């Protein structure tokens, strides 16, 4: 109704990668003015599944930020384009932020969504306050068994022809071809019947996706290219102790390799205590995994996100002074010294809060 | 995938994508008869006929070693033309080259014929090797056909013709057997067939991220000392 507001539109196939618009659900915050959070769901996974996580009073995430549960291109209701280049998919978010009048946002993701979120910070860092990645790492996962299954299931889904196949023929196909219960449920709910019951189809572009995965080259979503570069801002990673996607042994090094400010395990990288279960990837289902993710998320949003690099926490804003490099300012008659860096309002561009407060300041004097 | 982002990639001081007349200080300038006493120049108008005679020699001197293979002479002719049509179809404005592209290409082709006259040009040796590898495979087929045996190429052609009948015998709702379907049927057969062969490892990485070389033997250690020859 009010808290839950998802803009409605129809996907449009686009020949130009720049004329791509993203659509998703918006969750309003409890308080009037709060920074915004943009969260990308796992590939081929529903945004609705994350609503109870972001709308739980026990966690109270909306008390911190407004949440945009956004679908990437070729997924859900967003526009469709065969390319999955993270630079192109990142520019899509920048246009969404512009059309929605968002100066800068907090980015989050689950699994492959985490890659997409981190890519935006790599290509557009001046407008991203932080990244919160869940069970993902900036790494080539093409040869992880978990990815192969997802890559394999998507290929099986290309065999079904909705025009000829009946509803029962589909259900039998999924149970036999898809063993994982969650993926099976995810794919079923992605099936939709267009207006006038012309035919049933998947909400995500099955053709464009399978080519990306089946080709299994650099542009694949499992791959993380050196072209994506480095993320300069705040980044926090949370993944299960026993996770098929992120192995604690070596899959943590890519974080240091790609994220410059990542301190390491126990500060910006955590693992949730859990058992071996292939379903642990879906933390929002299990309360034990979710409670830890939420607490770490609220801590990142409250104290670490949108904080200058050389500052420890938000507590140091206004009391910790950063050293200055010599000959860094235009003024020649400037006595170089330590300074507290400027932290701006989250939507200072599309509002006039600075112009307004300047007037109020004059009235004092 | 990846595109060059620099918009000025093809810019030169002479213009966009100019590889025919680069800008240099000592530029060409005209000459006037009434004021010119003497001149030393090597340019002439003999390149057209030298371009013709060069083609005839390169063709006739390479055919000496084809042993009357008509199919090779015709294939070589198509390849020889591709080498002489470079200035006629290139993006480079070969007509605007600095000091005469006609003389330049002719002199460049002459250096190729010099090697052809000695039968030392790499295209010649590449041709002999490629052809011998081809005839050995055609003779292997001939020996199998004279014996009444079936070739590996026919076993697939016959195995593919039946697979098509099986697909269109069940494809009754529709009746458009596209070329795409015909293709992925053969590829499914080629991958299965190629994997069956004991071929050297071509891809760096196998199903796992690990490399498929003889050097990718890590711990744990489970191999004993090497054993000697048996008598």
């Amino acid at each position: 109704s009010r808290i839950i507001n998802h803009l409605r539109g129809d996907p449009v196939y686009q020949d130009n990668t720049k004329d791509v618009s993203l659509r998703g659900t918006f969750l309003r915050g409890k308080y009037d003015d709060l920074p915004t959070m943009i969260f990308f769901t796992e590939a081929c996974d529903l945004t609705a599944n994350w609503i109870p996580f972001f709308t739980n009073p026990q966690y109270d995430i909306l008390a911190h930020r407004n949440v945009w549960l956004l679908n990437p291109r070729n997924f859900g209701n967003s526009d469709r384009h065969p390319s999955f280049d993270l630079q192109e998919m990142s520019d899509d978010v920048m246009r969404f932020m512009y059309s929605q009048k968002i100066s800068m946002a907090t980015l989050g993701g689950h699994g492959i969504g985490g890659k997409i979120a981190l890519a935006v910070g790599c290509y557009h860092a001046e407008r991203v306050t932080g990244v919160f990645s869940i069970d993902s790492s900036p790494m080539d996962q093409r040869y992880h068994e978990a990815f192969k299954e997802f890559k394999g299931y998507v290929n099986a889904l290309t065999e079904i022809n909705f025009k000829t196949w009946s509803d029962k023929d589909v259900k039998v196909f999924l149970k036999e071809n898809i063993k994982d219960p969650k993926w099976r449920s995810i794919f079923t709910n992605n099936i939709s019947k267009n207006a006038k019951t012309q035919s049933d189809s998947f909400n995500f572009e099955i053709n464009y996706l399978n080519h990306n995965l089946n080709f299994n080259k650099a542009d694949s979503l499992g791959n993380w290219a050196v072209k994506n570069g480095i993320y300069t801002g705040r980044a926090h990673f949370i993944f299960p102790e026993y996770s098929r996607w992120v192995h604690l042994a070596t899959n943590t090094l890519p974080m240091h390799k790609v994220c410059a400010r990542v301190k390491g395990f126990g500060h910006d990288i955590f693992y949730v205590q859990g058992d071996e279960n292939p379903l642990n990837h879906w933390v929002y289902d299990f309360e034990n995994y979710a409670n830890v993710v939420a607490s770490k998320l609220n801590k990142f949003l409250h104290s670490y996100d949108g904080v200058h690099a050389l500052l420890k926490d938000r507590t140091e804003i206004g009391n910790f002074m950063i050293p200055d490099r010599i000959k860094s300012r235009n003024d020649s008659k400037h006595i170089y010294g330590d300074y507290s860096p400027a932290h701006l309002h989250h939507n200072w561009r599309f509002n006039h809060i600075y112009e307004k407060h300047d007037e109020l300041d004059k009235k004092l004097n | 995938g990846y595109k060059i982002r620099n918009k000025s990639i093809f810019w030169t001081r002479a213009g966009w994508k100019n590889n025919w007349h680069p800008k240099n200080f000592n530029a060409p300038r005209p000459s006037y008869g009434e004021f010119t006493m003497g001149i030393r120049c090597r340019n002439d108008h003999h390149s057209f006929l030298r371009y013709v005679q060069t083609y005839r020699n390169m063709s006739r001197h390479c055919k000496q070693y084809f042993l009357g293979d008509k199919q090779l002479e015709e294939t070589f002719i198509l390849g020889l033309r591709s080498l002489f049509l470079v200035p006629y179809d290139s993006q480079c404005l070969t007509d605007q080259i600095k000091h005469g592209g006609e003389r330049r290409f002719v002199d460049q082709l002459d250096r190729d014929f010099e090697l052809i006259s000695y039968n030392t040009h790499p295209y010649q040796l590449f041709t002999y090797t490629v052809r011998n590898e081809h005839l050995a495979w055609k003779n292997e087929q001939y020996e199998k056909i004279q014996k009444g045996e079936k070739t590996f190429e026919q076993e697939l052609l016959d195995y593919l013709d039946e697979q098509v009948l099986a697909e269109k015998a069940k494809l009754r709702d529709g009746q458009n057997f596209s070329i795409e379907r015909m293709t992925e049927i053969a590829l499914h057969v080629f991958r299965k067939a190629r994997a069956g062969k004991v071929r050297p490892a071509q891809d760096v990485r196998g199903p796992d991220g690990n490399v498929n070389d003889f050097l990718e033997q890590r711990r744990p250690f489970e191999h004993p000392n090497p054993t000697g020859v048996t008598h």
Binding site: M139, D140, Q141, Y143, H144, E145, Y242, H247, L248, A249, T250, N251, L253, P254, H256, K257, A260, V262 | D208, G209, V211, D213, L215, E216, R218, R219
Partner: peptide, 29 residues
């Protein structure tokens, strides 16, 4: 990061394994 460790342990930070096997061979091909 630019602070990866000691010079002796430098060839350690390169390996990235696709499986959960321990211990992990360090050498990156």
């Amino acid at each position: 990061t630019l602070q990866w460790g000691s010079l002796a342990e430098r060839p350690m930070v390169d390996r990235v394994m696709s499986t959960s096997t321990w211990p992990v061979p360090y050498y990156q091909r």
